[PDB]
Point group: C2
Chain length 193, copies 2
């Protein structure tokens, strides 16, 4: 349909991970759900929390997998199949190590790029879904990635992330209406300062 | 049957969690398994990795749930019910915030103590299993706990935990033979040299 009809946010369940960087995706979809008054409810059939409502005159579904990050396909895949949502109609929001806090970008296609949530999704639905890449920064080395993704950010780049998040939220209208290239131009132009 | 016939280690699956404090139970069971040459294999029926073999003259089963910590009972409960293993024959090894690194204790009964793995187990099999509490230290405050349990210990604290674990490994013979009071005395007496 061009129109984005399913918005997924990646992350891990529970209060001990709610503030960690790896939950950037959840931050985006939870805020988007509040903004439009969409209720997120337990959806154990699809191993997630999900909702459905009107975003700018369109019927859109929202999904947070409760599988833990690296099993997110166990929710996304059956959900996408049951509602017959094609990949081109899916936006997946997720944390991105290779972009600094405050950077945010909309991408279409490509692989998983080392993201372990997307690694579990691409093999079963293919790559042609859209991705909202929320920068979280990269720590010094590979040895430190785990402590970085599963740690809470300092107030500073958590301020930066939130601003970028809020900006992407302001462009969701363009996505649900099928204007992806414009959404891309407008989201990708965001400058933290 | 005071003899221990099921030894469970608690933790989170994946290389990114393997060296974290919350996996202290997995460290104990993996090392136990290698000591006696018991192979741990994928056991998707029970949402974990399990093995079975002779420990010091007794046939013992070993289980690592692959559910993530807070869903441990989704492995332990059906596994123990399928093999008709009573709670009094189970030992569960886990990290304990309430004891320091290099402190290790054997406990029978009681509640979960705020441990979110045990919280998922005690409701279904009751409290009367044995616990090998492996001290990991408590950081300053309730808000530092997540980053502590999901963090890798510095090498001086790791060595203290490893010594305690090595000491418990040497007393497994007493547990599988049924001598729980002697094991409790000998384990709980441990002090780093
Ligand atoms: Na990458
Ligand atoms: Na406690």
């Amino acid at each position: 349909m061009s129109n984005i009809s399913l918005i997924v946010g990646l992350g891990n369940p529970g209060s001990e991970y709610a503030q960690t960087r790896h939950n950037a995706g959840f931050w985006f979809v939870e805020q988007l759900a509040d903004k439009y008054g969409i209720t997120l409810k337990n959806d154990p059939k699809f191993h997630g929390i999900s909702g459905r409502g009107n975003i700018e005159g369109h019927d859109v579904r929202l999904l947070l997998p409760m599988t833990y990050m690296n099993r997110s396909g166990q929710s996304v895949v059956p959900f996408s199949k049951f509602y017959q949502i094609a990949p081109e109609a899916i936006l997946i929001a997720h944390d991105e190590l290779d972009m600094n806090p405050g950077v945010i970008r909309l991408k279409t296609g490509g692989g998983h790029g080392g993201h372990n949530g997307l690694r579990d999704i691409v093999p079963h639905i293919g790559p042609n879904f859209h991705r909202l890449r929320i920068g979280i920064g990269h720590p010094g080395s590979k040895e430190r990635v785990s402590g970085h993704v599963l740690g809470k950010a300092p107030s500073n780049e958590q301020s930066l992330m939130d601003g970028a998040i809020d900006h992407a939220l302001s462009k969701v209208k363009l996505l649900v209406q099928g204007q992806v290239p414009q959404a891309m131009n407008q989201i990708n132009a965001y400058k933290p300062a």
